[PDB]
Specification:
Length: 253
């Protein structure tokens, strides 16, 4: 069976697309406002050197902080999100922030050279830039694998925004209060996605796609935990806080 999208489901999709268009600048025109990226010589991938300088951390921390603000804006436009208590809204945002960033970053990621290309050379982010920010391959490898995997799903923009919305409004987040309400909101989004794929996504892929998308949400949970471990190590580095931002300190602290 291929039920058609209800008027409400169409509205939800239009709302999410508009929300994404208002919060994701495909030209990356604000990036020059961030603290400048610095790339020091480290072909050897020296952890000692990387930690002593954390040359790319100020720039990436500003990028991530900027992105969190956008995700907050996006979340506030998700149908139903405002119905949640302020406390639940914050718990969901803090717990999914890094995951949504990884998801939305897929738009700038390119398999041409496996990098996130946001402009000229200065704003082309490679795995080497992540290491220069203090991270290890335990996070980087899975991250790239995840990016390529998501790219291959060839998601329609409609599927992309729904996946981000579903990621945010998850009832199984530590600390949530009204899980039932959150699940109700998420189910409404999941059904919309499931329905969209069935009557709008042409084969090969009319099916199987939903499961693959759900699996990516699971992958995101693992990356979230790995990033958390790495962030902890990073926080031990003296003077690290100055290379971050208040928003970032709260979200990952
Ligand atoms: C943000 C966005 C973009 C790219 C994403 C990237 C490339 C550079 C490195 C990133 C930011 C990965 C890096 C794992 C995160 C590590 C940094 C970090 O622990 C911290 N930082 C502040 C406090 S701790 C995750 C997503 C990757 C560009 C554009 O698509 C907008 C998108 O929101």
């Amino acid at each position: 069976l291929r039920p058609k999208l209800s008027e409400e489901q169409q509205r939800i999709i239009a709302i999410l697309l508009d929300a994404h268009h208002k919060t994701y600048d495909p030209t990356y025109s604000d990036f020059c406002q961030f603290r400048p990226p610095v790339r020091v010589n480290d072909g050897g991938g020296s952890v000692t050197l990387e930690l002593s300088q954390l040359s790319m951390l100020p720039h990436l921390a500003d990028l991530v902080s900027y992105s969190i603000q956008k995700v907050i804006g996006f979340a506030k436009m998700i149908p139903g999100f405002r119905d949640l208590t302020s406390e639940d809204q914050i718990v969901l945002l803090k717990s999914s922030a890094i995951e949504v960033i990884m998801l939305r970053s897929n738009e700038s990621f390119t398999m041409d050279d496996m990098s996130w290309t946001c402009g000229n050379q200065d704003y082309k982010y490679r795995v080497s830039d992540v290491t220069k920010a203090g991270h290890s391959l335990e996070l980087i490898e899975p991250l790239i694998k995840f990016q390529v995997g998501l790219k291959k799903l060839n998601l329609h923009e409609e599927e992309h925004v729904l996946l981000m919305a579903i990621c945010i409004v998850s009832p199984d987040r530590p600390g949530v209060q009204d899980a039932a309400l959150i699940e109700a909101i998420q189910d409404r989004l999941s059904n919309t996605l499931q329905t969209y794929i069935r009557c709008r996504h042409p084969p090969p892929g009319s099916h199987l796609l939903y499961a693959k998308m759900i699996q990516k949400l699971a992958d995101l949970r693992s990356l979230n935990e790995e990033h958390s471990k790495q962030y902890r190590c990073l926080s031990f580095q003296p003077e690290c806080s100055m290379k971050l931002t208040p928003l970032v300190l709260e979200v990952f602290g």
